[PDB]
Write a protein that binds this ligand. Structure first.
Ligand code: FAD
Ligand code: FAD
Lengths: 488, 487
């Protein structure tokens, strides 16, 4: 065949491009490597009636305006989330804010200065802000915080996801934190009836657009200019059937770093040379649904780290105004190196493009043992962070740990695991690297070509965005490229 | 041109192949991507008269017989090393041995069983040893230790490089540790006048062998069979001049995982599909040479959080030859400390050896980190810091900003090697859960593009049966040697 515009990748950014480009009236095609699914890192499975987000769960719409706007324009609402909470002059909580504000030269409690910062200011910071003579775009976040007259000590033990041991671009993670440290963005909200709800609504308005053919099961595996000097692109697309060959005047790669690296030979050196301007962090989620929970409503998230190979362990029960069975659900949410523990419980090598539910008992076998220890210890202490129901407090007192194991192992109705470090994602999210001038990459990536000046290839997505980690970045990224695509 | 046998890679295994193949009488050529140097991961720089090993330092010749033998046959001596030292029935140092011996079903004090274990036994372990129904070749080391009736909890926050958070092949790291846990070893030896001494001696006997042309500055960047079905190989070799094109009847890839992955398109799928059967661990060394040390004459290596490092090792001159009283500090670190320091290599693009005295910012940050710890060590005294009386006092009095500067000034020369960098991509490698090592080593020892020619080979530590050590690199060389007939 032949098409005006191909879009490789049907993730949030792939599709926000497939929308705005339809609304200006182009003949779009959306290749998407996955047969049945759409929205990539957006994953919401229903597990014994619980909404289990294998991908994003909450959002800060005040911070992520363009998210709200794609939510609004699509009829997606946001149920505000009200869920549970959690060496001298250096005596506070988290408050890397001290570290940042020292670097920026302000008072370590100058929260007005922080709340007044614009994107325009963030750009001025990233380009021009220095620390001990060095630009911050050239430094580790970890190094800038450890400098003469900053911190140390540095607690990665404790804290949320600040990517200290990954040592990201100082400027870009000073920027990122100065954002989430504004007074707003405490407004925390789920998406009504799942996060994948947003995927659906975007296809339901992307079906009522005539000039859009959505083509699941299609994976871009090649790109050549047809003739030297000319803008016509040859796309090798492998699919279910077999190895088709599309042609287009404009290809949009809505792909994170790992797919792009698998395409690296088929890309201009000047672009392919920079795909390593970001690192993909792995994250891994495990969900267990328990018949007979040991925790009440409002049991706080813990930071198990030791007790379990996990970072966070999150706790869910059905609303107390329902509870048709009284069941509950546990999220093990983990980064490096806990990810390496669980990685190996995906039974299918070769392919892992979505959660594996109820396919390895060994995942429960290891969840059981780890919790079994902790809930014999929590009965006694009572000053343990594990609330523990009266029913559970007693019955555990009596069972021989080896049986507390089995009680929990039996208790599991359904369980699932998503290892986001696996192809074709290779990461839950990405981070700029020390040395990188993000703005040089984002400009090069938004629009490029094989050497005609055609400006008819694009990269879009979170990975090389100005708001990494969030759908907002994926959206900012889509726009940057949209602006370089004229009407038909 | 055209050659009997090319050997890509002039590291220890590349060269032990270039030797034994000369001694059977082939017309060898050794390509080596590095212009000036040989022996790759073997790196020994002289720093204000100190032997600084950016690569291997010590060795266990009892455990590594084939190392001793290549040392002996080359006139390389080993100065035995006598350097400084270091919840219910679960309260010791090497609860690791507890964990292993639980898995293996023996008594956690069965040290005779351990000392009696042969290679043939290690193979039987690899292939057949199970845990809760699962073969260990299929498990994480971390998972096997955390099992019902083993450990937990697991202290990786202590300990010397056990690769728990890298979660390596349970069987292959049970094997690896059961080796270094023999009493037989622990006999620790440096190499006489540096570790790179062994590189030199191997070229000095590799010069007196007529049928060997050594070609530094040459990097294999492609391999095609000349004709479909026929054993003739086309080598694209980039060099100083430019892009020559050799031909050979037999190519030996003495290369770790990362260069082989850069050649992955030029390799048979059946081989390239398995290069990810191992992980390359990054390690990073920084060396500082200090005018006026702050530490005692037996100051133990520490396990520093306190610094972004894992080990911090302490050196003075043999004080029988100490003409200035100087001392040296080795920051030796794994993930994630590696990420802190890696950014202080001033040359992007290329890093094939240590960068000495090329970034003051490395001292600037060493100073501050130690400056804190040695103001705390003046007072507490309940510290591993054997601080000298001269140092204990003078530090008491100086402000941080001056304690930093005292140390910053004290530094004569400093260096950094980031082994995670091309073309090494790792200080050493580890088998992965799922892998049957023995299936990989058999596939790798000899293969071809489909003729049956059996005229390509992979050799080196990375896919060896003794990962981490030169012994593995040597075991690997042999496996392939055995499949190469005499001329
Ligand atoms: C920090 C550290 C500590 C160590 N400690 C010990 C120890 O205590 N005990 C011990 O026994 N061993 C130790 N070792 C082992 C050491 O790694 C040995 O040198 C050995 O493992 C190297 O095996 P190799 O032959 O694969 O060497 P390599 O150096 O990996 O050989 C590869 C060579 O090929 C080259 N090359 C790469 N690409 C190309 C190309 N395309 N064409 C041509 N040439 C190419 C160069 O990279 C290099 O010279 C240590 C290593 C390190 C780094
Ligand atoms: C653990 C986790 C936590 C998150 N937390 C938050 C959060 O707190 N707040 C927030 O706002 N967002 C969060 N997110 C969301 C994340 O920011 C976005 O979902 C994502 O980054 C944006 O999607 P994308 O379009 O950029 O890329 P992706 O969703 O990765 O899109 C890639 C798509 O390309 C496809 N594809 C098509 N053709 C090819 C091909 N040839 N090769 C490869 N792939 C191909 C598929 O791989 C895939 O569907 C989280 C995500 C995860 C996984």
């Amino acid at each position: 065949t032949t098409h005006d515009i191909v879009i490789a990748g049907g993730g949030i950014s792939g599709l926000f491009c497939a929308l705005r480009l339809a609304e200006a009236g182009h003949r779009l095609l959306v290749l998407e490597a996955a047969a049945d699914r759409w929205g990539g890192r957006i994953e919401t499975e229903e597990m014994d009636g619980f909404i289990a987000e294998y991908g994003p769960m909450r959002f800060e719409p005040t911070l992520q305006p363009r998210f709200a706007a794609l939510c609004a324009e699509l009829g997606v609402g946001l149920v505000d989330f009200f869920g549970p909470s959690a060496e001298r002059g250096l005596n506070s909580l988290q408050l890397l804010k001290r570290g940042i504000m020292l670097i920026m030269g302000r008072a370590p409690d100058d929260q007005a200065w922080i709340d007044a910062l614009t994107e325009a200011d963030y750009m001025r910071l990233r380009k021009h802000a220095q620390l001990h003579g060095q630009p911050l775009w050239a430094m580790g976040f970890w190094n800038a915080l450890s400098a003469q007259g900053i911190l140390s000590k540095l607690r990665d033990t404790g804290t949320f996801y600040h990517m200290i041991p990954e040592n990201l671009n100082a400027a870009e993670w000073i920027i990122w934190w100065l954002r989430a440290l504004k007074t707003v963005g405490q407004q925390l909200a789920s998406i009504e009836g799942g996060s994948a709800r947003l995927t659906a609504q975007l296809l339901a308005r992307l079906r009522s657009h005539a000039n859009v053919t959505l083509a699941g099961g299609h994976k871009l595996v090649g790109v050549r200019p047809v003739e030297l000097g000319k803008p016509t692109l040859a796309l090798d697309v492998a699919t279910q059937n077999g190895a088709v060959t599309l042609r287009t005047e404009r290809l949009v790669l809505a792909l994170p770093r790992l797919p792009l690296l698998k395409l690296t030979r088929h890309l201009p050196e000047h672009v392919a040379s920079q795909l390593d301007s970001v690192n993909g962090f792995p994250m891994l989620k495990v969900f267990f649904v328990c018949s007979t929970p040991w925790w009440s409503y409002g049991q706080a998230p813990q930071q198990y780290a030791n007790c379990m190979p996990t970072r966070e362990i999150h706790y869910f029960r059905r609303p107390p105004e329902a509870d048709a069975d009284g069941h509950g659900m546990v999220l093990l949410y983990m980064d490096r190196p806990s990810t390496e523990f669980w990685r190996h419980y995906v039974i299918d090598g070769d392919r892992h493009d979505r959660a594996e539910l109820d396919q390895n008992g060994r995942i429960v076998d290891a969840f059981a043992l780890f919790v079994a220890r902790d809930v014999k210890r929590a009965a006694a202490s009572e000053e343990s962070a594990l609330k523990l129901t009266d029913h559970a407090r007693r019955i555990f007192g009596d069972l021989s740990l080896a049986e507390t194991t089995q009680y929990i192992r039996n208790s599991i109705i359904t369980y699932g695991i998503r290892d986001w470090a696996r192809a074709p994602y290779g990461a839950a999210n990405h981070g700029w690297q020390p040395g990188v001038r993000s703005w040089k990459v984002m400009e090069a990536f938004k629009a490029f070509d094989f050497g005609s000046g055609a400006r008819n290839l694009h990269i879009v997505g979170e990975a090389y965005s100005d708001y990494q980690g969030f759908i907002e970045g994926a959206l900012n990224s889509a726009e940057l490229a949209l602006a370089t695509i004229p009407a038909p």
